[PDB]
Structure 1
Amino acid sequence: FGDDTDQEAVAQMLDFISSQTFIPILGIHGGASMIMADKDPTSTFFQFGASIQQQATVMLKIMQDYDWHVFSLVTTIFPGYRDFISFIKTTVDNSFVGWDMQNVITLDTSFEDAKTQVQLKKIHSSVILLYCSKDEAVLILSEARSLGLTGYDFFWIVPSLVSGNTELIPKEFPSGLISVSYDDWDYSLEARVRDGL
């Protein structure tokens, strides 16, 4: 099954089905393909996608190939972020580049634009990594547009969970927003299910 909407927990529901039916279940598209945290040992659920570590490797390879070195790191309390920051820290620890890293800007809650605003104003660097859900991404990018953090030197590289469906490109996104996903329209759904079968 491949989902068309942007609800990842559907796949989690399918994950529970893979905990109960003992059937190998392949998440294919959309919210059925979105990466969850930890698949169960009794589960036989498998997704056609990459890890967050391989996708972070791809994003840092982009930053290495395009020489954007002084960066920041902004996450919310949407989970799966601690291992992401740990992978970035170990990548800096395994770096012959000599990366520069502004410290981690976290967010307390859904932002009141009171305490997170001073945290965002600490940033005056070029490239910012943002890791949150898609509506929260719209809210944070609207805040950065209000803060003027969407300029020419102000780049944004986001994972696939920020992007989601390629058929829907919502508002408040900069014309030049850098995203890394795997929802290729050329790589057809028929080829997906044929390879799975």
Structure 2
Amino acid sequence: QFGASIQQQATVMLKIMQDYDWHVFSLVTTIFPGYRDFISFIKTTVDNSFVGWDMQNVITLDTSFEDAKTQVQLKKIHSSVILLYCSKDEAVLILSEARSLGLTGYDFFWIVPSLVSGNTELIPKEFPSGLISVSYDDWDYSLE
């Protein structure tokens, strides 16, 4: 194939966070596979950075949420930048739960990977206007 990997995309997103000095952040991971490599890559990147990042503990989901034990970990979130790694189906429920929590504020940023960013036409109403996404979908360079 072509393009970047999920590790190079994570490097680009941490470069975005480095260029804006958003050093206080968090990390929320679901049960989508390839997640422990993602967490370990974030840990080795923070350990290989000139920043000294303020990383909150990883909020790990288990199943479809009862909104009883996951809410305890969601109320621990006092940082600004919220890092979410999930699929498109669970992202609607996560953003709706965060909107019900009031954790979708002006300082509460949301940066998502490329695979959760699905169809350009199909956009659910639960997306915050200002949702940061990174993908290789370039319209200036066509297929030819």
TM-score range, shorter chain: over 0.9
How far off its partner does 1:184 sit? Answer: 2.2
Deviation string 1:81-138 (CA, Å, 9 cap, x unpaired) is 1000000000111011111000100001011111111111110110010000011111
Q: Give the length in aligned residue pairs.
A: 144
User: What SS does structure 2 have at the residue aligned with 1:130?
Assistant: strand
Q: Which runs of 4+ in 1 moved over 4 A?
A: none
Q: Residue 85 of structure 1 is aligned with which of 21, 39, 51?
A: 39
CA distance in 2, matches of 1:167, 1:84: 28
Deviation string 1:55-98 (CA, Å, 9 cap, x unpaired) is 00000000000111110000111111100000000011101111
Q: TM-score by structure 2 length? A: 0.95
How far off its partner does 1:168 sit? Answer: 2.6
How far off its partner does 1:158 sit? Answer: 0.7
CA distance in 2, matches of 1:144, 1:80: 24
CA distance in 2, matches of 1:49, 1:161: 13
Gaps of 5+ in 2: none
CA distance in 1, matches of 2:138, 2:114: 12
Distance 1:69 1:102, change over 3 A: same
CA contact (8 A) 1:129 1:157 kept: yes
How far off its partner does 1:171 sit? Answer: 1.6
CA contact (8 A) 1:166 1:183 kept: no
Distance 1:99 1:182, change over 3 A: same
How far off its partner does 1:165 sit? Answer: 2.6
Q: Which one scores higher on RCO, CA 8 angstroms, separation ≥ 6? A: 2
Equivalent pairs: percent with the same residue? 100
Q: TM-score by structure 1 length? A: 0.70
Name the structure with the higher helix share. Answer: 1
User: What SS does structure 1 have at the residue aligned with 2:115?
Assistant: helix
CA distance in 2, matches of 1:184, 1:142: 29
How far off its partner does 1:179 sit? Answer: 0.5
Q: Cα RMSD between the aligned structures?
A: 1.1
Larger radius of gyration: 1
